[PDB]
Write a protein that binds this ligand. Structure first.
Ligand SMILES: *[C@@H]1O[C@H](CO)[C@@H](O[C@@H]2O[C@H](CO)[C@@H](O[C@@H]3O[C@H](CO)[C@@H](O)[C@H](O)[C@@H]3O)[C@H](O)[C@H]2NC(C)=O)[C@H](O)[C@H]1NC(C)=O
Ligand SMILES: *[C@@H]1O[C@H](CO)[C@@H](O[C@@H]2O[C@H](CO)[C@@H](O[C@@H]3O[C@H](CO)[C@@H](O)[C@H](O)[C@@H]3O)[C@H](O)[C@H]2NC(C)=O)[C@H](O)[C@H]1NC(C)=O
Ligand SMILES: Nc1ncnc2c1ncn2[C@@H]1O[C@H](COP(=O)(O)OP(=O)(O)OP(=O)(O)O)[C@@H](O)[C@H]1O
Ligand SMILES: Nc1ncnc2c1ncn2[C@@H]1O[C@H](COP(=O)(O)OP(=O)(O)OP(=O)(O)O)[C@@H](O)[C@H]1O
Ligand SMILES: *[C@@H]1O[C@H](CO)[C@@H](O[C@@H]2O[C@H](CO)[C@@H](O)[C@H](O)[C@H]2NC(C)=O)[C@H](O)[C@H]1NC(C)=O
Ligand SMILES: *[C@@H]1O[C@H](CO)[C@@H](O[C@@H]2O[C@H](CO)[C@@H](O)[C@H](O)[C@H]2NC(C)=O)[C@H](O)[C@H]1NC(C)=O
Ligand SMILES: [Mg+2]
Ligand SMILES: [Mg+2]
Lengths: 867, 867
């Protein structure tokens, strides 16, 4: 399968864009709104479609392109929810478009081709439209049922007819510039008379050597004798002129019809710039003037014109039979859009500058003798545009009735929405069976309105909803960094899709707010229903399934990307120690964690249970429930893991290195202090502690070792007088300065004074102060003398056993004489020794250091802390 | 702190609800819209506020009630995002309400109290309103700045004045029924003359024994002599009547003014039911008829009336100083609402049935000699209502200017929105300083409009937005089962909150669609900004923080509730085996998992690395990256865990029992088969396999042991001819029937025929078929003979070593002669023995069973499978 860009993307998109709105409703729109506002309408309606084409190209380039059609790409690149919601709005738009094309062909048949055939001679026109539209819809449905092959064969002919029509229009204009046609329109003062009835527009004619009243007189004056004075004042007071209706292109005409002329329902189409002496008038004369049919505005014209720029999704419709789709879909679509936009602009200016401003406003060509107003300027004859538009409308109706059921069948066989499974019951060949009937029924329900000017806004609403959803999906997926979404289009940026969504939403609300609300509610309902059904199909439950799907999506999206945050906040893993009877030994660790997190962040609570898994599952479940209850009491929102190991050491290690799912990992381990390690003889008291410390420093995790956890305050407790003391010695400054702030952020330490003690002094104070300004703690800074010999233990261990104890006891003396009355004391601990045997000496160091302090918390940095 | 329900909730809510709209704009609304549509407006505007009061009660009962005010409850019970968004709309509503009350007091001062004081004598009224409103706003701001204590002291007086006003109105009506007042209104045909200028309404009066033209003549006719014929035709053609303006209560008047009388801008207030002979008229007479001031409709009246039922959040405003708030806030609020609604209904009917339908439509009381139209019926004098409404408006303005800056200061000190931190810089006493200035500026910007009929819809938009957000939050949090949200209100149901949200949204869009769009965009912007800032504060990054917060919220919400799903879908844990050089040994396990999941669900991929953590972290990270790449290649979306253990057995156990976060856990373990176990001498080949099997059967997890994994198809492979074979023997029927369906759902097995082989036969076939109908697989069912002796191994092991082999070899013979050419064969495996030593015999059994089959997959149920 291989066909080029032109005959694969360009010509189908062109054939789908050029429609009936141009012939039947371009001149009327231009005359009612002027040339300027018409150009503005065309620009506004082309910008939304151009931004949507850019977003569609960004969709069509990422990855491989599915070979099914234009609905499979959207789904594959935006998810079943979005794609399903988009597909239904597009289906409804297409079926209503079929209805509109049938209505247009009926109007062209009953008004210009053969008026005598109308059955009903107000509401007679509406009933004729209803009857003939129903007959046409039935026959077209039968044709599509039996003869799809001939339609696909003859589809080129309709495009040939459209192109020949446009060429003839432009040839007629260019011939108009130097030698225009003749189409006299008659005038009464500054009113417009219907030339259909009268033989000639003249008050009196000379027959048999004398003057006699003409048909215009007998129609306006009921008396057939000139010597009468019982007629309306407007006829006798004003003259009767015959101005040419097609003045050749000039700068005087384009200057005349350049400003808006919005009429009201029932008003008279008047030629601004003719002498008129006002006077009352009878009520038997109104059937002789041309009348405005519907109320005209700006939003009305926007709504009526928009369905003439839709069809940009028809270019990416032979995706399977394409040579290189990534390079052939976007360029073809955008070139088709540009060609259509330039043709519309040129045609607006040409109509404005070539035709009278009073014959453009005859929606049905009443001033002229019931001709196609746009067909008046055409070189060969006004008969080429009539037949051309008739065949174009028939072909567009046939193609819409062919392409809507196929899309419905695709959506039904995709098994997204479950209640429309029957609509996928295709024939033996694949041609839909019970989707054609539903489509014909919806098209009939649309035909029953029987007025293009009322069917067009619904069509516009559905297509605008589809475009808005495509744009919004693209922008959001680009912003939030979805895992499988990376488009390769060059001229693409999420700002463009966002602007397109905004513009098409503005249009959707300008046309009719209530229709837009109904469309938005339908779209939201289908989106949520697709999401719920997908959740129930993946997991098993509806609501819990929704939560599981949201969690999985967030974790998967969070997986990709740089795994480092610009800031550092403690996300703890509280290693609780269960008793022999499975009771929490130190329930104050959970309280302290709740005070340090304040209910925001991640807090996992692990614990190891010695034994064997094969025979100890119930114990694990019971302990998990116990920890969950104890954790609910202390008001800390977190998860709870319980593992059953053979030795507690390896259980602790596995718990430290494996807790979380992907990016939701901990980065801080808060373990308690071993009590009675030197009292008892069992050496294992302090080996587990040292091993967990060494295992949490090799994973680059922070460390919080709250000593004397039995004296820490509870949540009901409150502090009124007291001062936190910080004793940052050398390293770990960031966290030593960030912990007391996050601590005092709690009501228990809501107003505890902070004092920063740091073992040129003025320069150091200035730096600490400038750093504190960003934090805003403003705690008093007191820098005591720094003796390198005393601090040689921290410097030597980071980057002499007898000396170690000396320095630790001198440091302890200083801290206990200058910080004894402190509420909470925070100081950083030195790293454990490299030699696995000096652990006793390291423990003695750590014990003699914090001698006397009532409550002391030791923090060890991980090294990856930034702030 | 303890005060009752009445003086703590009822009276403040009552004082906040009864406003100026009732006096200044009740009669006008009733006359323009009739009695029926007025009652409908009151009902529509009371239903939204009643449903909002029910939702607010449901909020006020769950948990403890914060003692701060009415904004802390909403925040504490709905989250910082919702509460912050609600607080700002409420602040804007309150400040614009202050503007409206100042405008009302100005109107009452310049129109009835003292008209000569107006500075400008159209736009003179607007300029007078602007100047005087600015002066009033300045003086009121200064008073609130200096004298809050006196305001809080005197707040009771304003309620006393309002109550006395209403009592006087009703006393006047009841006195009207039997002896009404005198207020003659003059008429011209069926037009309404302004009685202010004329001395008496009579064409001619008799002075000095003869008739002379009266002031009405000289005002309507410029000639002061009766003998003139140069006047307008309407004056001479019609009469001059003097009808009473206050007809006592009767059923004839309530019948007259019962249908709508919507006028247009500039129309004349006409008395339907008086003789009038039409005629043209001059243009110097229009300043003498009463005129309609603004265009009236239904939506206009809805918008103008709505700010008279707002203030239901003022009852829950002394939460701290309450005896028992859970029982005192809801009953008080709802009783205040009911009292206000009944007073409005009774007043609408009383006005309709007591006053002429032509003097109700004088917005400024022009027909009467510039009196308060509602003050005409009042027993003591019309002077009590004027002064009462003046003092009420002044008091309401003062209280709004006192209560808006306090709310802004609370929001600013809560540190939710960061850019308004300055507005919390209260005085030494707490009274706001730079929040009062901002509030006064916004109120001035609102005063510059200087028309109640244009300020009221903005107020309505803000309050409706606040109410809609409260209702939506309540309904959603009740539906999705938020963890900390359980209200105790009896008459509360999420359907009521949903209906309230719908009704108040309908109102918000009926009044003015564009205003509603602006309000909704403001609310959404503030919601998303609060969410982003909170994410950046909890975690550290903006976008990644958003993802982390969504994941944590979903997991926490999913934690609570029954942990069993009605359906069972496999969520796998693929235990890969890494090589000595850290390469995936069997990369086909990942392919098979991707074919069985099809990219939807949870798939964790664990692996154990022997060694020691203290010295093997880089190996773990490298292996994790390797597995991530290999898993991305095979197109399976899952997480990857790597642990470093000392012995692979306990690593596998810890991986089996601890993988996931809360509810996102696996329920199926897919491990491979040990190859070369009998070939090599190392006994550990089959001990790890048996141990993992026994460890995964004690955790109640399913088990998938794909044998001969080297012959399984790849993703590029396709199958055209072949038939899946199922050999369900006794147990594990649900999963043995669900696995092939989920398998064939993949394109690789898209059309492989399924054959169900099952070792009364007709009854069994009928049951299997009925079960298959729901699945819809419709696979052919062939039931072979079931010999109990051969099946004695499965029956004896679930619920003789020589016999075991016999039965296994006979079963293998049957399966290999009737299923040799099968594509994939699925049969359930028996459980491992209880005796830890018969493992060799169990392995020999499992090996001799699947002898000859090219591809065989064995499944073992967990026992908790439902479908
Ligand atoms: C077509 O002829 C009709 C009827 O002869 C013209 O209607 C009349 O046009 C004159 C302007 O030339 C209007 O006079 C102006 O009226 C406005 C508002 O009343 C006033 O402010 C101006 O100072 C001036 O008096 C006149 O009202 C209008 N007649 C009616 C009944 O409205 C019409 O303008 C002619 N031209 C068109 C339609 O382009
Ligand atoms: C107040 O007096 C005014 C002027 O005298 C009345 O206006 C005129 O009322 C009559 C009805 O009694 C209208 O006649 C009707 O007009 C409609 C539509 O044109 C027609 O369908 C009916 O068959 C009938 O002819 C007349 O049009 C109207 N005059 C104008 C200029 O509109 C008015 O109705 C009196 N009563 C009120 C306002 O309650
Ligand atoms: N079985 C366990 N499960 C979870 N965490 C543990 C376990 N054992 C120890 N820990 C962690 O190590 C810390 C040190 O406890 P450790 O057992 O060393 O001291 P102890 O229990 O107070 O008594 P001793 O020091 O005499 O053994 C505990 O607070 C806990 O954080
Ligand atoms: N180190 C490991 N990490 C993760 N999973 C493992 C590990 N070792 C074994 N397993 C699991 O157990 C299964 C059995 O593998 P096992 O080592 O028993 O057989 P083998 O490697 O094929 O060779 P042999 O049977 O001779 O040892 C593996 O497929 C895997 O699922
Ligand atoms: C009606 O048509 C006539 C014919 O063109 C207009 O012109 C008038 O012709 C008479 C004949 O001599 C002259 O006396 C008048 O002076 C002409 N009018 C002007 C303005 O020159 C006539 O004006 C038309 N009437 C109206 C109301 O347009
Ligand atoms: C104007 O007022 C008079 C006084 O009430 C109306 O009544 C007419 O009075 C004259 C005096 O004899 C009678 O002849 C007429 O028959 C009375 N009218 C009727 C209907 O009985 C008079 O009708 C008023 N005019 C209008 C237009 O309402
Ligand atoms: Mg120990
Ligand atoms: Mg082994």
């Amino acid at each position: 399968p291989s066909m080029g860009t032109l005959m694969g993307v360009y010509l189908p998109c062109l054939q789908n864009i050029f429609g009936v709105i141009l012939f039947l409703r371009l001149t009327w729109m231009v005359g009612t709104a002027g040339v300027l506002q018409a150009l503005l309408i065309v620009l506004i309606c082309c910008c939304c479609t151009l931004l949507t084409a850019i977003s569609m190209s960004a969709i069509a380039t990422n990855g491989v392109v599915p070979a099914g059609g234009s609905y499979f790409m959207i789904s594959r690149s935006l998810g079943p929810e979005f794609g399903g919601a988009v597909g239904l709005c597009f289906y409804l738009g297409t079926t209503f478009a079929a209805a509109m094309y049938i209505l247009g062909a009926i109007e062209i048949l009953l008004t210009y081709i053969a008026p005598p055939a109308a059955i009903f001679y107000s509401n007679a026109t509406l009933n004729n439209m209803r009857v003939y539209g129903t007959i046409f819809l039935t026959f077209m449905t039968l044709v599509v049922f039996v003869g799809v092959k001939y339609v696909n064969k003859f589809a080129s002919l309709f495009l040939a007819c459209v192109i020949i029509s446009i060429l003839s229009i432009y040839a007629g204009g260019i011939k108009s510039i130097f030698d225009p046609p003749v189409f006299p329109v008659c005038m009464l003062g500054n009113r417009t008379l219907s030339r259909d009835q009268f033989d000639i527009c003249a008050k009196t004619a000379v027959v048999d050597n004398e003057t006699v009243a003409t048909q215009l007189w007998s129609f306006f004056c009921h008396s057939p004798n000139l010597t009468t004075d019982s007629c309306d004042p407007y006829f006798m007071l004003n003259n009767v002129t015959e101005i040419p209706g097609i003045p050749g292109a000039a700068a005087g005409v384009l200057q005349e019809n350049l400003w808006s002329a919005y009429l009201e329902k029932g008003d008279i189409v008047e030629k601004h710039g003719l002498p008129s002496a006002d006077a009352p008038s009878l009520k038997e004369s109104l059937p002789l003037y041309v009348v405005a049919d519907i109320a005209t505005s700006f939003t009305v014209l926007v709504g009526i014109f928009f369905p003439s720029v839709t069809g940009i999704m028809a270019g990416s419709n032979r995706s399977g039979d394409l040579r290189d789709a990534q390079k052939s879909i976007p360029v073809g679509t955008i070139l088709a859009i540009i060609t259509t936009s330039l043709v519309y602009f040129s045609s607006v200016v040409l109509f404005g500058a070539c035709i009278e401003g009073v014959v453009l406003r005859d929606k049905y060509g009443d001033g002229v003798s019931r001709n196609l107003v746009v067909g008046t300027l055409a070189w060969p004859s006004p008969w080429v545009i009539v037949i051309g538009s008739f065949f174009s409308t028939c072909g567009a109706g046939l193609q819409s009735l062919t392409g809507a059921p196929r899309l419905l069948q695709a959506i039904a066989k995709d098994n997204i929405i479950p209640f429309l499974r029957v609509f996928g019951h295709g024939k033996v060949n694949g041609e839909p069976t019970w989707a054609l009937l539903l489509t014909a029924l919806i098209a009939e329900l649309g035909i029953l309105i029987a007025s293009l000017d009322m069917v067009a806004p619904i069509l516009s609403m559905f297509f605008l909803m589809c475009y808005l959803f495509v744009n919004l999906a693209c922008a959001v997926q680009t912003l939030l960094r979805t895992p499988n979404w990376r488009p390769r289009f060059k001229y693409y940026h999420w700002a463009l899709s966002f602007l397109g969504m905004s513009l098409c939403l503005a249009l959707m609300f300008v046309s009719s707010w209530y229709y837009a609300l109904v469309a938005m509610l339908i779209a939201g309902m289908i989106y949520k229903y697709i999401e719920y059904q997908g959740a129930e199909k993946e997991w098993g439950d509806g609501i819990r399934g929704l939560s599981l799907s949201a969690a999985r999506y967030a974790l998967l999206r969070l997986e990709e990307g740089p795994p480092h945050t610009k800031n550092w906040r403690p996300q703890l893993l509280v290693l609780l120690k269960l008793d022999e009877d499975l009771h929490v030994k130190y329930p104050r660790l959970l309280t302290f964690a709740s005070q340090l997190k304040a209910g925001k962040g991640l807090t996992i609570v692990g614990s190891v249970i010695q034994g064997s898994f094969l025979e100890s599952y119930g114990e694990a479940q019971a302990a998990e429930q116990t920890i969950k209850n104890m954790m609910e009491i202390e008001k800390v929102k977190g998860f709870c893991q319980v593992v059953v190991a053979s030795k507690v050491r390896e259980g602790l290690a596995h718990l430290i290195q494996s807790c979380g799912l992907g990016g939701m990992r901990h980065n801080s381990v808060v373990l308690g202090w071993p009590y009675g390690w030197r009292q008892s003889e069992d050496p294992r008291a302090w080996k587990t502690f040292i091993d967990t410390v060494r295992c949490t420093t090799a994973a680059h995790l922070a460390l919080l070792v709250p000593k004397n956890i039995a004296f820490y305050p509870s949540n009901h407790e409150r502090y009124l007088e007291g001062h936190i003391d910080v004793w940052w010695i050398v390293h770990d400054g960031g966290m030593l300065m960030l912990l007391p702030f996050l601590l005092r952020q709690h009501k228990v330490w809501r107003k505890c004074r902070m004092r920063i003690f740091t073992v040129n002094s003025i320069q150091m104070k200035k730096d600490l102060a400038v750093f504190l300004y960003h934090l805003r703690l403003e705690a008093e800074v007191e820098v005591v003398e720094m003796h390198n010999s005393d601090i040689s233990a921290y410097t030597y261990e980071r980057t002499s056993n007898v000396r170690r104890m000396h320095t630790a006891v001198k440091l302890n003396e200083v801290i206990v004489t200058r910080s004894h009355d402190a509420r909470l004391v925070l100081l950083n601990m030195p790293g454990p020794p490299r030699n696995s045997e000096g652990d006793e000496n390291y423990m003695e160091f750590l014990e003699v250091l914090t001698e006397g302090l009532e409550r002391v918390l030791l923090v060890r940095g991980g090294g990856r802390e930034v702030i």
